Each structure stands twice: as C-alpha cells, then as structure tokens.
Structure 1
C-alpha cells in the first residue's frame, strides 16, 4: 500500500516483461499511470520528505503534483491509442493518432521533468522524478521501434532515438547524483542517525536505484528483444536498532562497519545461534554463518564468530537454503533499561521461507512482532508473502558492544530475488549476468557500484605475464542447442586488450576502446560494450585483462540467442565495410594509395571466412571486388615478377644463392622470399631489380614498400641520383629493432631521360652469417608529385649527379687511354697473339693495376650490377687475362708463377706459397736451409732467357741458379711499398736437362715468378 510496495511491483514487471510492445505500454498504466490519483503522488513525496525531515516548498510541490497528473491523463490516451493501433496496424487514423499522441507525450514530459528536478528540493522529488523519466524513456523507446510503422520518417526517428540514448545517461546520472548527496546529507554520528541513514538508503534503493538500474535496457538497438536484468545489491534491516526508543552515541561508524564490504555474491546456507543470559533474560549473543558461492560451484565457507559465544542454552543451527531461502524475519526485541546496566538485544526470531507451497518456519526461541516485511515487502500481492516476496535473506552480521551497556544487534542483509542462486541462461531473451555473480576473482577487486548498476562491479587490475586479472563466472544452459553471442559491459579509461574465454576456449581477443576519462566517479555513459564475432553453444565464462598498464571495470556478461542467418549477416556487413574501405571512391575504380598490397590480402582473408551455406550470393559478389582491388594493386605495382616466379630467368629479379620461394605462410598468402646469411662478407645474399625510366614520371616521389615477417641484418637499397639505405631488423610476432612489420622507403625522380636511362635500383642484401629475412607483398609505387623543398632537393641531387658524371667522364678518358696503352705495350701488337719477348709479369701486373683504377665498372653497393664503365673495363681485363695465359704457356718452366702452390716443384725445407694481391701467388723462402728446385728439359744448342721477379727481405742474398751436370752454372742474385725487381740472363745448355734452384743466404726471399724462355725472334 506504500510507495515501496508500488515500486517493487513495477520492478518485478520491468525484470520479467522488459520487451517493446503493447504488453509494456499497458503494464505501466495498470501498475502506475492509469490508476494513480494526486494522493498517490502526494504519498510518494511524503515518503522522502518525512525521511529527510524537510518538506518541499508549496508552489514547487503543487506544480509537481499537477504535472504528474497531466501525465496520468496524457499517457492514458497514448496507451488507449497504442492498444487500438496494435489491433489494427494499417488504419491511417489510428496511426495518425499514434503520431500525435506521441508528440504530445514527448512535449509534456520534456516540460514536466525539469519541474521535478527543481533546485533545493531535488532530493524529496527524486522518486517521482524517477517515475516520469522511466516513462519518458519508454515512449522514446516506443517510437524508435514502432515509429516507422506509425508513419514517422527516418530523420525524426533517429532524432528521437538519439534523444533516447542521450537521456538514459542524463536521467541516470541525475538520479544517482542526488541520491548520493541526499544520502550524505542524512549521515550522522549516532544510532538514530544510522537508522534514518539506512532507512533512506533502503527506501531509496527500492523506489529509485532499482528502476534506474533498468534504464539501459531501453536501448532498442542493444536490446532488440526481451532482456532480463538481475539486481544484486543488498539492503539492510536491524530490528534492535530500528525500534530502539533511544540512541547510542558515536556508534554509527561501528554499526556501518558491521555491514560486509563489496564481495562476490554468495548464498546464505545457515546461521548457528548462541543464546546467552543476563538477569534470567535469554538472548541472541552470537552466531555463525556458513555460505556458498553462486551455483554451489564451490565448497562452503565461513566467517569469524559474530557477537560472542553464549552457553545459557544449547545452540541452534538454523538452515537457510530450504525452499527458496528466508524471505522474512519476525523478531522479538528486549530492552531492559532500569532506573539509575543496560540491555538491547533480541530474545527470538522466526525465519520464514519462500515456497510455491508450504514450509514450517524455523524459530529461534520465539517469534516477535518486528516484522521485516514492513521494511522489505512483497513484490506480488496476488499471492501469499511466501510466494510473492521480493527478497531473500543474504547474510546476518552483527553490531555489538560487550561488557557499561550490552548491545547484541543482528544485522540482516536482503538481496533482491532477481539475484538467482544459480546463473541460468535463457534462450528466448538476452540474459544479463553481472560479473559479481562469479566464483573466481584473480588479481582484482569487487568495488561498490555507483547506484545505477543494480549492485557492485568487478575491477580487474593491470599486470608481468602470469599476473593477468581474471573473473570467472559459472553458467548453466537449459538449452544446449541454442547459439549465443557473448557481450560484455565494461569500463576503461584507455583502450585495453581483453580476452574472453568460454569454457577452455577463447572467443574474443582484441583491443576495445575507452569509454571513460576517470574510473572513480563513474557515470552512465562511462560504460560500453564489445561482443564476440561468432556464436556458440564449455560451462563457465571469463574475461582476462591483458594490459600490463591499465585496469578495467567489468559490469556484466550478456548472452544473446541468435540464428545462423543472423550470424552470417553480422560477418557480411563487417567484411563489406572492409572491402569498400580499399577504394578512393564509390565506384571502386581506384585504390587508396595508402592501402598496401598486404592489407588487401588481410581483407581477402575476411571474405573467405564467410559462410558458404548462407551468404554465397553476396560472398561471391564481395570476392569479385577484393580480387578486383588486388588486380588494381598489381596494376600500380611497378615491379616486374611480383610473385618471384622468374628470378634469374635478367630484366626481372636478380638473385643469388641462399634464397627460397615458398607459396604461403602463417603471414603471407602469396609467394614469398626467404633469404639466409653468408659465410663471407664479399659474397652477399642479394635480390635486386632495376626499374625502367619509361615506367617513371618526372618530378615525382616513388615508394618502395612491402612486408617483413621477420628480419635480421637486412640491407635495403634505393638507388637513383645516389643510394639511400636502411638496415632492417624486425622480430616476429605470434597470434634498432623495427616495431612494425610494414616497411617503406622513398625516393624522388627529377627529370626522366630515356637516353641516360638511370631507373631505380632496388636491392636487398645480407652480408653477415647470422642473418636472414622473410618478406613479400613488395610494391614499388607512385605516391605523390614533388612540391616545395622536396622539389628543390631533387633538382640539387640530379644537378649534383650530373656534375659527378662529367667529372667521371673526364677522368675516365685519361685513365682508359693510360691503361689501354699499358695493355698494348704487353703485346707484339699483332692482334693479341703474342707477348713481347721482354715483357715480364710485373709489367702485366702493373698494367692490370691501371685497368683496376677504373672507378665505376661496378656498382659499389652490389658489384654484380654493371656501372657506367662496365663495357670498357671488361674488354681490358680480358686482354689482361689473355696476357697471363700467354705468360704461362711460353714459360718452359711448369708452375713458375706459384699459381698452383708447389706442384711441379721439389722442396727440401719449410717453404710456403701465399697469395698477396688478387690471384698473384708468391713463393716465400723464410730460411736458408730450404731448397725449391725443378728439373727442366731443354734443347741443347738453343738459347734461353732466365727471368726472375722477386725481392729480398732483410740480410743476405736470394738466389735462383741454373745448371747442367758439371761446368755450366749461372746465377740471378737479389739483395739489399711492396714492389719487385726483375733480373735476367742468357743461358745456353750444352745438354738436354737443366736444373733451376731457388735459395737464399739468410733473411727472407720472395719470388713472384720464375720464367725460362727460348730466344726466338
């Protein structure tokens, strides 16, 4: 019969029937607006006014009640019109009437609510304010569903939808704010203050917060179908204190502390009660509580003894989880306060259970007349209290004092019955399980709700790895066969990566957005949602806070029944949006330049995951477009042989050993490239390609880019007017150092000239042993035309390369002449047939060094790439290689150069042949006892030239001598940056054998070549 009774009846309706329709519209009239007079509105104001002890100003109060009246009358019209329209949807008069009534309803409300929020009296007005706002939200939510069907145009529906969500927030934040400051205003130091304080809290939770808690569910778009919330907050009664005919000083903090702080929800299993005695008055002195987690999903637990052990009588375990729990307490109080020792306790209490039928009430000692049901009344008056109660007993703590006065004041928590002992998932509606109904909290806290949630929330803390915040909720599924998408309501001040598990499998893991800008004063719009992409049928549900850095508030888990067509639709929209975002324009004719080749690959992946069972028509369509995008990417890609199909087959890819092409990957979806290291720095692993001038456009930046799975020591070159080069090390990822796998590199074209034919060299190099790379999706592309500084830089670069060429082209005319003449002086001039008789090796070597002083025969960066001067260097060095060949053939001495180490030589001591300047091999005689010798056949009577090219380290003299058996021995002697002397002599063997013998006196002797030749002109 009181506002709390009325609220609880709305609360039940809102929990059980929350779904757009005539049942809803009709529900509000029957419960409230159709059946309330001005005395009912008066009654509501008095409830809070009495409490806070100050009445609303009369004009304001008068204004308030006549508005509420205006609205009863209005809404009755809207409801009656709604009803009739429902019965005949197509009747245009019934529809116009719907439109008009809606408009008028929206006017009145917008105007009347500010009059229920009037300064200085916001508090005593709140619950009624809450009423008008609950109603405002539903008409807005109506028009957003039925608007179209009534004849409103989309423009006007979205405007009023935007209003709807603007106002879920506003109205909620308002109520919550004034509840707070009303609550604080009524706090005070004594037990009397506490009674008013708690009574405020309890009454206003019942007529205010509970409704507000349901306000989100008006979001038609978030909650298209029936959606069931659960209120988990606790409310408190305290018999002893609540009708103590006095007040205990400075006790209200002590009393308030005897309420349990924020916890995971638990079921009250039993109370075991201790009787003590004072002047032959027997009383409840202490007691003990057992409890279980939600869903008896854990073992039971307990708490330290409340109050004090007593032994005046046996003790009495009262079991609470029988039927549906305890819904009522009838308590006997005792106050002995004899004229002058003092007593304030309970001598008995009945605990009564909720049942669809009947259960004997468990009595501690005796019943009494301090009925809890005055304070926590039933929600349903169509049945006995045992059936129609609103609350279950949740815990019984205690405020105590001890040995001048005795206080034993048991404190009763009542949780709302919408808080089910188990977490059962429906299948025809969205089910809301608040995270607080969980049973495993690792690295995080429960912290009291701000009022607009129905209860407390879960904080998961920031990390690092094995310290991830985690909340686990047990959940039962009546219907196995039902497919659900999970949605989570959360709050964070930063974007956080979150993983949601279901059973042992992880159904969501990505970074969700921020929603707030501080987690301390939490406002309605501070919360948000995310959902799994798919829908499924394990038996628990969980969230993990992956962030090392920030925390996250988890409100509630939401299970959303879904058909397979719905599923296929969600993913289609998602993928359709992806493909479209590749193109510049609405006609899909061009790619956005900053869309990379690899990106187009990620997006195509999305398409192939679409159902073949429900989306084929519209999936094929999408795959047309993404293939089309890709084709356009290949069009803009200026590199030949993109997929490395023809490396080395010259005008495509140039490549070395230590490369590998596999077709695909964890990362790559197309042919890609693996490069491994080298054992010698001079023999690098290289993939290169020239880009033809004819494909380039003047005065334009170009961009080399691609994707590297991972990398170490990867050397990347871009070469036109000069070479730029990155070294690139990129670690892999799972699912100095580059944090990104995308790379890019820019170069700028000046004037293009086909005749000069610069182009752009693209070169990938690895010159170390540990060393590697995995890359693909390589593009070379046109980016932007050159403007401002970049332009003047390029003009400077070309101009500067232009000046470097002229220089080079001048110095090369000198040197070539010089080298070419030195080359010619080696030969008998008759076209590369013969060496002059008297040209020696040092000469060949000297000519060689004049050839190798040619500066751009080969590109510095990678010397397999011919330079400006490749043509002319090449011909001269071949004339040189011819020359060494001729030197060798004519030498009557086998291996006189030491080019084959020591073969064809007879060696006595310790001697070595070491290479010194290019292929050039030298004999080292390190000690005088060593002897290198060769027997040579000759033509007796002919004449020979013995030529030695060598030098002498240190003291003494090096010798090459020559002889036959007995008298005919002759000698070449050497004594004294690194340069050789050439000596010779004429020898005339008497016989058919000669001996050549190399030796020395001391120090070290070094011989380049020993030659023996016929004198023949």
Structure 2
C-alpha cells in the first residue's frame, strides 16, 4: 500500500535532480509540466499524503483541519497552473512579442501564486497536527521555493523593479531556513514517538524513517540548490543516505518471537564512508516439518563484502550474521553489477504448537552499466521453495514508469544483514539500499558546478570520523576533532585539457580555522574560514557556511586531501561537501 505517494515522492526528487542550480529554459518548462501532472493535478495526491502519515502514526487529522488544508490546496493549484501556462508562453515566444502589457500579466500571476503560498503555509502546520501534515507541508514548501527562484531568472525580463527582485531573494533565504528546520524538527518528533521495545515497534519505526526520507528528507536536501545566484550554472549532485526496506518474513504475526527493537536498531550499519555491494555468502539450514513431507530449507545466515569508494581497492568483509550453514554455502558476486531489484519467496511449516518460517529463494536483478546489459542472479534453498511474498519494487519504486526498470530504477542494493529470532525459531533478513544518483567515479563536470560529499572519501585520518548527518544534507558528515589531515578523496576529471576551477566548502566550525587542499600530496590551496557555531550547539540550517577558496587551480592529479588547523581543545569541525566551479 501507499506505493502511489512513494512513487510520486521518488519521481519529483529524480526530476528535480535534473533542474537543480540555474536550469535552461526548455528544461525548466518540461519539468513544470510533469510537476503539474504529478503533484498538482487534483486533490487526490494531497489527500493521499495526509492519509500516508495517518497510517504511519496511527492517528487522524481533525476533519476541520483536513478540509481547510484541502481548500487552500485547490486555490494554490489554480495559481500554479495559471502561472506555468504563462511562463510556457513567455519562453516559447520571441523577444519581440514582449510588450509592457504581457510583462504585467506574468508579473501579477507570479505575485499572486507567491503571496498565496506564504499565506496558506500555516494551514499545513496547525498545532497538534504538525507531524501528520509533514509530507503535505514538505511538498507545498518545495513548490513555494521552486516558484520563488524564477524571480531571479526572469525578474528583469518581466520588468520587475530591482527592489522587487531583491525582496523576493531575501524572502527565499528566510524561508529556505524555516521550511528546512520545520521539517527536521517534526520529523524527529514523529521518529521518537515510534520507538518501542518489540519487533513490531521497530518495523513501524523503520517504515516511517524510510517513507519520510523518500517524501520529505530527500526533498529538503535540494532547497539550497534553488539559489540561482549562488548556483548560476547547472549542478551535478547526489544523495548518499541509506534506507532499509521492511524485513523479509513468512508470517504476518510472529507471536512474540520477532527480534527485539534493540537487537535490530543497535546492530544496523553505523555512519560509514560510502561503499558498494561486492559479494554475499548465503548460509542455508534444514527445517524439518512435523510430518517430513512439509520440510524446507531456508536462509539462516550470511556474510557480506563491500568495496570502498573509488581510490581504494581493499574489500571490506562483514562479521558473520545469523546461523552457520547446515547445507552447502552459496556465493554470489556483484563486481561491476548494480542490483536494482530483489524478489523473495518464503515458506512455513505448521507444527502442533509452533510455526516455522523462512526465506527460501531470492532473485536479484542486476544491470551492468559498462557492458550495458541486465541479468539475474538467484539464491535457492533447494528444498520446498514456496511462493514469492516480498518485492523491493513495492517499497522502492522506479523514478520513471516510462523506461525499462534497468534504466528507470531509483535505488541499488548496498547491504544484507541476517537477524536471529527469539528462541531459535528462525532468521529475519534485512536489506540496506542506496540512491541511484551516487556517481562511483567522483567525476568533476567541466560544464557544471559539482557537489562532492566528503563521505565519498576512501580514507579518513588524524582521528576524523563519519557522524550522523543533521537530516537536511542528503547523507552523513565528517567530524574533525584534531589539527591535521582529515580526508583523502579520489577525483575523476571529465576533460583532458588544463581546465581551471574554484573550490567552495560547506562546513560548520566552533572556531576560526584554516583549510588546506593537496593533490597527490602537494598543497595547492590554503585559506582562512569563519567560526559558525559555539561548542555544544546542535546543528540546524544556519550552523553551516558555504565559503570559497581565493585562488583557482587545475586538476593535475586525482588524490584530493583536505586538512584542518586552528583547532583548540574541545573544538569541532563538520565537513559536508566540497564543490568545484568551472572557471576561465
């Protein structure tokens, strides 16, 4: 269920990834038409977003609050549609038909929509219903901000006063901070409300966390890229966060045998440098049926191996998860394959006073981007397989239903972990996924502004570590506590000739610091950076600063090293991303 809103959520993010930064006119209009068909066609999507959170929270919005929200949304739809049709005409029509009379038409349509948004927003944030209105608020907030940036692109063409364009910009800055902070605050409120002790508590908790990531958190991560003044070119970026699909189980009710909340939550992957699925070792066990005829084999445990980010080749192998094999081990290798789907079979044996169930078969769909070919690899228990009961596509739909899956998928497999049920009743497998936008090569685009997340480094040093992200950056961050080197990231230049770049850094610091940049161990850039926070402070939107390095440089190597100095006892520096600006 709810796959509809999940798909809409996934698609919007996927489309926006193509019109982020300063977009070209044709691309902007194309986006807008899909946008209107997806998010703004009727009241149906809005109603579905409200029901989505009500389902996750097991609470309902007061009818009066639900109705007013829907009323505001009908009005906002008209404003958006009227605006888009006019914008479309403007782009299409030559720089001749632009008379003062048509300029005023577009100016008032724009002013109306923008104003209606500021006025309506509080309706999606009524006291006591903040969490329940989260996906609705996130989608409305996104529209408002996306709409706003248009004033910086077409402002002068439309004949707006310098004062008007400026007022719009300040308004965009204030709202980007507010809307972001609002979403993170209530996201967390909801998350804590779902913490429990049972296995059933954890499934709910994790479903909320995954669904809120796809529909809210991924979206707010794009907001800063709507600043076409700071980002006067197209932006190449990616989402580095993990999402965990629902556990694969044969029965709807485990009658108390499900792994406890703590035994799952405390053992799932902790903030780590980015990596890729490399290998899986399947362990199988025999489950006897009370009458022999009803027996079956099942996936009991596993090993997982991942390869790090480009620049390092040493394979990381996981501890053993679950139970040792009673049957012959099965190994699947993924070197240079992208797992875009996983479909599973489960089976059960009913005993006089017990039920035993397990995952008997798993079919993995893989795509080879090098040899441009799809194929499948499967795990088979080999004894009484049963039927398919779990499909990843239901939880992680494709970005587009237009293209074939191997082209339009939204996520790929990163991790596999087996949990043991209480009292030796079986094994629960849990799968971790990563977003399709992640570029393995860490490629620096010669025409765009490239955002490089620090978690794409292959080596941390001087006691630098991966820490949980503040929920609005699309992934995790790097914490620096000592003076010295911090991270080494491998970079792939897209051009051969001596193209020059400017670097910008998105960070947070308790003190004034010095950042140093090196290529293949040779320093080339060193600069002074401001303090952004006080010791102890929690990280909100304003905690981060985006600052340039003075001097331009060429990519005469691949190994980029970031180093920090100027720290004192108790000082901390958080690094999110490094950006490259193609310059002449």
CA contact (8 A) 2:61 2:132 kept: yes
Which of 188, 192, 214 is the equivalent residue of 2:196? 188
Distance of aligned partners of 1:2 and 1:433 in 2 relative to their CA distance in 1, 3 Å threshold: same
Mapped pair 1:315 → 2:319: no
**Aligned position for 2:94:** 88
**Would you say 1:475 and 2:480 are equivalent positions?**
no
Residue correspondence of structure 1 range 399-438 to structure 2 within 5 A = 399-401=419-421, 404-438=423-457
Of the three residues 451, 455, 476, the one matched with 1:456 is 476
Is the aligned partner of 1:490 residue 2:494? no
Distance change in 2, residues 1:520/1:339 (3 Å):
farther
**TM superposition shift of 1:347:** 1.2
Match for residue 276 of structure 2? 267
User: How many Å apart are 1:237 and its aligned residue?
Assistant: 1.6
1:306 aligns with 2:314: no
User: Counterparts in 2 of 1:239-254, with a 5 A limit?
Assistant: 239-241=247-249, 244-246=252-254, 248=256, 251-254=260-263
What is the DSSP-based 3-state SS (H/G/I as helix, E as strand, rest coil) of the residue aligned with 1:2? Answer: helix
Sort the Cα spacing of 1:483 and 1:476 in 2 relative to 1 into closer, same or farther, 3 A: same
Measured after TM superposition, the shift of residue 520 of structure 1 is 5.2
With CA pairs under 8 Å and 6+ residues apart, which has the higher RCO, 1 or 2? 2
Partner of 2:409: 389
User: What's the offset of the Cα at 1:120?
Assistant: 0.9
- CA distance in 1 between partners of 2:52 and 2:397 (Å): 15
**1:123 CA displacement:** 1.0
- Number of the residue aligned with 2:291: none
Aligned to 2:120: 112
Aligned match for 1:350, one of 358, 363, 378: 363
In structure 2, how many angstroms separate the alpha carbons of the residues matched to 1:483 and 1:12? 30
1:124 and 1:459 map into 2 onto residues whose CA distance is 33
Q: Which residue of 2 aligns with 1:6?
A: 8
Give the C-alpha shift of residue 418 in structure 1: 0.8
Q: Report the CA distance between 1:79 and its aligned residue.
A: 0.9
Residue 27 of structure 1 pairs with residue 46 of structure 2: no
Structure 1 unmatched runs, 5+: 564-1017
Looking at structure 2, the residues matched to 267 and 59 of structure 1 have their Cα atoms a distance apart, in angstroms, of 48
Superimposed CA distance per residue, residues 459-516 of structure 1 (whole angstroms, 9 cap, x where no aligned partner): 11123xxxx2411111111213222111111011221122122333323323211222
CA contact (8 A) 1:238 1:409 kept: no
The answer to whether the 8 A contact 1:202-1:236 is kept is yes
Aligned pair 1:444/2:464, yes or no?
Answer: yes
CA contact (8 A) 1:288 1:303 kept: yes
For the structure 1 residues 170 and 159, does the alpha-carbon distance in structure 2 shift closer, same or farther, using more than 3 Å as the test? same
Q: Which residue of 2 aligns with 1:216?
A: 224
Shift in Å at residue 432 of structure 1? 0.9
Instruction: Provide the C-alpha distance between the structure 2 equivalents of 1:512 and 1:13, rounded to a whole number of angstroms.
Output: 34
- Contact 1:398 1:409 (8 Å CA) reproduced: yes
Partners of 2:313 and 2:572 in 1: CA distance: 27
Contact persistence 1:240–1:344 (CA under 8 A): no
CA distance in 1 between counterparts of 2:331 and 2:18 reads: 35
Aligned to 1:360: 375
- Contact 1:450–1:522 under 8 Å retained in 2: yes
Secondary structure of the equivalent of 1:30?
Answer: helix
Contact kept, 8 Å, 2:304 with 2:317, in 1: the verdict is yes
Shift of 1:340: 2.3
RMSD, aligned α-carbons? 2.0
Q: Quick check: 2:513–2:567 contact (8 Å CA) kept in 1? A: no
Which shifted more, 103-112 or 469-478?
A: 469-478
Alpha carbons 2:250, 2:389 under 8 Å: kept: no
Native 8 Å contact 2:492 2:558 kept in 1: yes
CA distance in 2, matches of 1:374, 1:502: 44
Question: Does the C-alpha gap of structure 1 residues 105 and 154 become closer, same or farther in structure 2, counting only changes over 3 Å?
Answer: same
Deviation at 1:337, TM superposition (A): 5.0
**Aligned partners of 2:536, 2:180: CA distance in 1, in Å?**
17
Give the counterpart of 2:573 among 547, 552, 555.
552
2:32 and 2:84 in contact (8 A); partners too:
no
Q: Is the 2:259–2:421 contact (alpha carbons within 8 Å) kept by the matching residues of 1?
A: no
TM-superposed deviation, 1:331? 1.0
Which of residues 22, 44, 51 is equivalent to 1:46? 51
Taking the aligned partners of 1:182 and 1:30, their CA distance within structure 2 comes to 31
- Report if the CA contact (8 A) 2:512-2:566 is conserved: no
Q: For 1:107-144, what per-residue CA distance to the aligned partner results, in whole angstroms no more than 9, with x for missing partners?
A: 10001111111111111111111111111112221102
Q: Identify the residue that residue 528 of structure 1 maps to in structure 2.
A: 545
Over alpha carbons, which structure has the higher Rg? Answer: 1
Asked if the contact 1:33/1:75 (under 8 Å) is kept, the reply is no
Q: Say whether the 8 Å CA contact 2:444–2:494 is kept in structure 1.
A: yes
Tell me which moved more, 243-252 or 224-233.
243-252
| SS of equivalent residue, structure 2 residue 492 | coil
Between the aligned partners of 2:179 and 2:579, the Cα distance in structure 1 is 23
- C-alpha distance in 2 between matches for 1:256 and 1:490: 29
Check conservation: 2:236, 2:445, Cα contact below 8 A: no
Residue 62 of structure 1: aligned partner: 67
Q: 1:139-178 counterparts in 2 under 5 A? A: 139-178=147-186
SS of the residue 2:160 aligns to = coil
Judge conservation of contact 1:195–1:242 (CA < 8 Å) in 2. no
- The 1:75–1:300 alpha-carbon spacing in structure 2 relative to 1, beyond 3 Å, is same
Deviation at residue 95 of structure 1 after TM alignment: 1.5
For residues 421 and 243 of structure 1, the distance between their equivalents in structure 2, rounded to whole angstroms, comes to 38
Give the secondary structure class of the aligned counterpart of 1:359: strand
Unpaired segments ≥5 residues, structure 2: 289-294
Q: What secondary structure sits across from 2:374 in the alignment? A: coil
Cα distance per residue 1:917-965 (max 9 Å; x no partner): xxxxxxxxxxxxxxxxxxxxxxxxxxxxxxxxxxxxxxxxxxxxxxxxx
1:241–1:445 distance in 2 versus 1, CA, 3 Å = farther
Query: CA–CA distance in 2 between the matches of 1:25 and 1:134?
Result: 17
Is contact 1:444-1:461 (8 Å) kept?
Answer: yes
Q: Deviations over 1:567-621 (max 9, x none)?
A: xxxxxxxxxxxxxxxxxxxxxxxxxxxxxxxxxxxxxxxxxxxxxxxxxxxxxxx
Which residue of structure 2 aligns with residue 277 of structure 1? Answer: 286
- Deviation of 1:454 (Å): 0.5
Inter-partner Cα distance in structure 2 for 1:10 and 1:316: 39
Equivalences for residues 735-750 of structure 1 within 5 A? none
With over 3 angstroms needed to count, the CA separation of the structure-2 counterparts of 1:46 and 1:525, relative to structure 1, is same
Pairwise CA distance, 1:547: 2.5
TM-score after normalising by structure 1: 0.53
2:561 alignment partner in structure 1: 542
Shift of 1:180: 0.7
Q: Distance in 2 between matches of 1:25 and 1:129?
A: 24
Contact 1:33 1:72 in 2 (8 A): no
